[PDB]
Design a protein around this motif. Structure first.
Motif, PDB file in Angstrom:
ATOM      1  N   UNK A 153      10.645  -7.940 -58.298  1.00 49.05           N
ATOM      2  CA  UNK A 153      11.654  -8.995 -58.372  1.00 49.05           C
ATOM      3  C   UNK A 153      13.005  -8.512 -57.834  1.00 49.05           C
ATOM      4  N   UNK A 154      13.011  -8.271 -56.523  1.00 46.95           N
ATOM      5  CA  UNK A 154      14.219  -7.854 -55.822  1.00 46.95           C
ATOM      6  C   UNK A 154      15.410  -8.723 -56.198  1.00 46.95           C
ATOM      7  N   UNK A 155      16.527  -8.069 -56.502  1.00 41.57           N
ATOM      8  CA  UNK A 155      17.768  -8.777 -56.778  1.00 41.57           C
ATOM      9  C   UNK A 155      18.236  -9.499 -55.524  1.00 41.57           C
ATOM     10  N   UNK A 156      18.320 -10.828 -55.608  1.00 40.37           N
ATOM     11  CA  UNK A 156      18.708 -11.629 -54.454  1.00 40.37           C
ATOM     12  C   UNK A 156      20.138 -11.358 -54.010  1.00 40.37           C
ATOM     13  N   UNK A 157      21.008 -10.929 -54.929  1.00 44.95           N
ATOM     14  CA  UNK A 157      22.410 -10.717 -54.585  1.00 44.95           C
ATOM     15  C   UNK A 157      22.562  -9.661 -53.500  1.00 44.95           C
ATOM     16  N   UNK A 158      21.818  -8.561 -53.608  1.00 44.96           N
ATOM     17  CA  UNK A 158      21.860  -7.550 -52.561  1.00 44.96           C
ATOM     18  C   UNK A 158      21.105  -7.991 -51.317  1.00 44.96           C
ATOM     19  N   UNK A 159      20.017  -8.744 -51.488  1.00 47.25           N
ATOM     20  CA  UNK A 159      19.201  -9.128 -50.343  1.00 47.25           C
ATOM     21  C   UNK A 159      19.942 -10.087 -49.418  1.00 47.25           C
ATOM     22  N   UNK A 160      20.710 -11.025 -49.978  1.00 47.18           N
ATOM     23  CA  UNK A 160      21.448 -11.955 -49.127  1.00 47.18           C
ATOM     24  C   UNK A 160      22.505 -11.215 -48.313  1.00 47.18           C
ATOM     25  N   UNK A 161      23.208 -10.267 -48.939  1.00 49.11           N
ATOM     26  CA  UNK A 161      24.199  -9.479 -48.215  1.00 49.11           C
ATOM     27  C   UNK A 161      23.541  -8.636 -47.132  1.00 49.11           C
ATOM     28  N   UNK A 162      22.383  -8.047 -47.436  1.00 48.92           N
ATOM     29  CA  UNK A 162      21.670  -7.264 -46.433  1.00 48.92           C
ATOM     30  C   UNK A 162      21.242  -8.137 -45.260  1.00 48.92           C
ATOM     31  N   UNK A 163      20.779  -9.355 -45.544  1.00 49.18           N
ATOM     32  CA  UNK A 163      20.394 -10.268 -44.473  1.00 49.18           C
ATOM     33  C   UNK A 163      21.591 -10.635 -43.609  1.00 49.18           C
ATOM     34  N   UNK A 164      22.740 -10.889 -44.237  1.00 44.58           N
ATOM     35  CA  UNK A 164      23.943 -11.202 -43.469  1.00 44.58           C
ATOM     36  C   UNK A 164      24.336 -10.033 -42.575  1.00 44.58           C
ATOM     37  N   UNK A 165      24.308  -8.818 -43.126  1.00 45.59           N
ATOM     38  CA  UNK A 165      24.603  -7.626 -42.338  1.00 45.59           C
ATOM     39  C   UNK A 165      23.657  -7.501 -41.152  1.00 45.59           C
ATOM     40  N   UNK A 166      22.360  -7.687 -41.399  1.00 48.02           N
ATOM     41  CA  UNK A 166      21.374  -7.542 -40.335  1.00 48.02           C
ATOM     42  C   UNK A 166      21.583  -8.581 -39.243  1.00 48.02           C
ATOM     43  N   UNK A 167      21.856  -9.829 -39.626  1.00 46.02           N
ATOM     44  CA  UNK A 167      22.082 -10.871 -38.631  1.00 46.02           C
ATOM     45  C   UNK A 167      23.333 -10.583 -37.810  1.00 46.02           C
ATOM     46  N   UNK A 168      24.396 -10.111 -38.465  1.00 44.35           N
ATOM     47  CA  UNK A 168      25.628  -9.791 -37.748  1.00 44.35           C
ATOM     48  C   UNK A 168      25.384  -8.663 -36.753  1.00 44.35           C
ATOM     49  N   UNK A 169      24.673  -7.617 -37.185  1.00 46.77           N
ATOM     50  CA  UNK A 169      24.354  -6.516 -36.277  1.00 46.77           C
ATOM     51  C   UNK A 169      23.500  -7.001 -35.117  1.00 46.77           C
ATOM     52  N   UNK A 170      22.526  -7.868 -35.390  1.00 45.10           N
ATOM     53  CA  UNK A 170      21.678  -8.371 -34.316  1.00 45.10           C
ATOM     54  C   UNK A 170      22.504  -9.114 -33.275  1.00 45.10           C
ATOM     55  N   UNK A 171      23.355 -10.040 -33.721  1.00 46.05           N
ATOM     56  CA  UNK A 171      24.162 -10.814 -32.780  1.00 46.05           C
ATOM     57  C   UNK A 171      25.124  -9.922 -32.005  1.00 46.05           C
ATOM     58  N   UNK A 172      25.791  -8.994 -32.698  1.00 49.32           N
ATOM     59  CA  UNK A 172      26.724  -8.101 -32.024  1.00 49.32           C
ATOM     60  C   UNK A 172      26.011  -7.228 -31.004  1.00 49.32           C
ATOM     61  N   UNK A 173      24.825  -6.727 -31.353  1.00 45.70           N
ATOM     62  CA  UNK A 173      24.067  -5.923 -30.413  1.00 45.70           C
ATOM     63  C   UNK A 173      23.622  -6.718 -29.204  1.00 45.70           C
ATOM     64  N   UNK A 174      23.239  -7.979 -29.409  1.00 43.15           N
ATOM     65  CA  UNK A 174      22.893  -8.823 -28.270  1.00 43.15           C
ATOM     66  C   UNK A 174      24.093  -9.002 -27.346  1.00 43.15           C
ATOM     67  N   UNK A 175      25.270  -9.247 -27.925  1.00 44.82           N
ATOM     68  CA  UNK A 175      26.470  -9.406 -27.108  1.00 44.82           C
ATOM     69  C   UNK A 175      26.795  -8.126 -26.345  1.00 44.82           C
ATOM     70  N   UNK A 176      26.677  -6.977 -27.011  1.00 38.55           N
ATOM     71  CA  UNK A 176      26.975  -5.707 -26.357  1.00 38.55           C
ATOM     72  C   UNK A 176      25.961  -5.424 -25.257  1.00 38.55           C
ATOM     73  N   UNK A 177      24.703  -5.810 -25.469  1.00 39.44           N
ATOM     74  CA  UNK A 177      23.697  -5.670 -24.422  1.00 39.44           C
ATOM     75  C   UNK A 177      24.058  -6.511 -23.209  1.00 39.44           C
ATOM     76  N   UNK A 178      24.528  -7.738 -23.443  1.00 40.55           N
ATOM     77  CA  UNK A 178      24.984  -8.571 -22.335  1.00 40.55           C
ATOM     78  C   UNK A 178      26.134  -7.907 -21.588  1.00 40.55           C
ATOM     79  N   UNK A 179      27.100  -7.352 -22.323  1.00 43.39           N
ATOM     80  CA  UNK A 179      28.219  -6.671 -21.675  1.00 43.39           C
ATOM     81  C   UNK A 179      27.747  -5.463 -20.872  1.00 43.39           C
ATOM     82  N   UNK A 180      26.810  -4.695 -21.427  1.00 37.86           N
ATOM     83  CA  UNK A 180      26.315  -3.511 -20.740  1.00 37.86           C
ATOM     84  C   UNK A 180      25.617  -3.884 -19.444  1.00 37.86           C
ATOM     85  N   UNK A 181      24.809  -4.945 -19.465  1.00 42.92           N
ATOM     86  CA  UNK A 181      24.204  -5.412 -18.223  1.00 42.92           C
ATOM     87  C   UNK A 181      25.230  -6.018 -17.274  1.00 42.92           C
TER      88      UNK A 181
END
Lengths: 49, 49
Positions: free
Chosen positions: B9-37
């Motif tokens: 029974x994973x605590x949802x409070x940490x999981x939602x924050x982790x999901x937000x962090x992961x999504x932010x990193x994904x989007x930022x990495x996609x943008x940086x990949x676009x800049x690198x290309x």
């Protein structure tokens, strides 16, 4: 016969008070069960979905 | 039952924050990949052709 009346023949005075107290406690238990089941959806509020 | 709950029974409070962090990193990495290309074609700019 008066002797047997002192072991059998439960006194209603305490019994009715016990019944009232038990019914009050049961009502309170149902109320608190509902209120406890009303807690979790704050997690859905967290999910913001 | 409570004990088993404390392990599963994973605590949802940490999981939602982790999901937000992961999504932010994904989007930022996609943008940086676009800049690198988008970086290299300065080499074409040198050739003036």
């Amino acid at each position: 016969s008066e002797a047997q009346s002192r072991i059998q023949d439960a006194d209603y005075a305490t019994e009715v008070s016990n019944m009232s107290k038990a019914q009050i406690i049961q009502q309170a238990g149902n109320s608190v069960l509902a209120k406890a089941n009303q807690v979790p959806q704050q997690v859905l509020s967290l999910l913001q979905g």
